[PDB]
Amino acid sequence: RSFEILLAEDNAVNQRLAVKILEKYHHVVTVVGNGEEAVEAVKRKKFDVILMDVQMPVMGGFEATAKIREYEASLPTPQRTPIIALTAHAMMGDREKCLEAQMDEYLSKPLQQANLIQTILKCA
Ligand SMILES: [Mg+2]
């Protein structure tokens, strides 16, 4: 049921929307505002699923994902946390690109509740 979610999203407005949805379904959300902070969070705590904005200041979702996969591999007991890409843009082989970038699923913004919750359940 209840999941620990890392949300990386640079836009404050979008952070609040996503948190409202996720908390409505009893999830526990850690919110960060860039890719560097997401990498730092993954080193400190195990999450059930990561929601990762593609375009972010300081460090984007593709770069952060690469670092996360490398770190989680380097562990004595390796782990792999699923990552869902969040993108405003959509529909032209984006999902494959995301999957090539080592992400698991994609969601277009603005986030749709049904899709968000079902994709988390698919992943976690
Ligand atoms: Mg962004």
Author numbering: 1097 to 1220
Give the exact sentences the study uses for this entry.
Then, HPt protein containing a phosphorylatable His shuffles the phosphoryl group from the phosphorylatable Asp in the REC-1 domain to the phosphorylatable Asp in the REC domain of an RR (REC-2) in two more phosphotransfer steps. In fungi, the HPt accepts the phosphoryl group from REC-1 domains of various hHKs upstream of the signaling pathway and forwards it downstream to REC-2 domains present in at least two conserved RRs, Ssk1 and Skn7. Also, we have obtained the crystal structures of Ct_HPt alone and in complex with REChHK6 bound to the phosphomimetic BeF3−, as well as the crystal structures of REChHK3 and RECCa_Sln1.
We obtained the structure of REChHK3, which contained one molecule in the AU, and we superposed it into REChHK6. Meanwhile, a closer inspection of the active center for REChHK3 allowed us to observe that the C-terminal of the highly conserved β4, containing the motif LTA comprised by the conserved Thr (T1183), formed a hydrogen bond (distance ~ 3 Å) with the C-terminal of β3. Specifically, this bond involved the main chain carbonyl oxygen (O) of Leu in β4 (L1182) and the main chain nitrogen (N) of the residue after the phosphorylatable D1149 (Asp + 1) in β3 (OLeu-NAsp+1 distance). Superposed REChHK3 in the complex revealed close contacts with Ct_HPt just for two residues located in α1 which had flexible long side chains (R1112 and K1161); thus, recognition of REC-1 domains seems to involve subtle conformational changes.
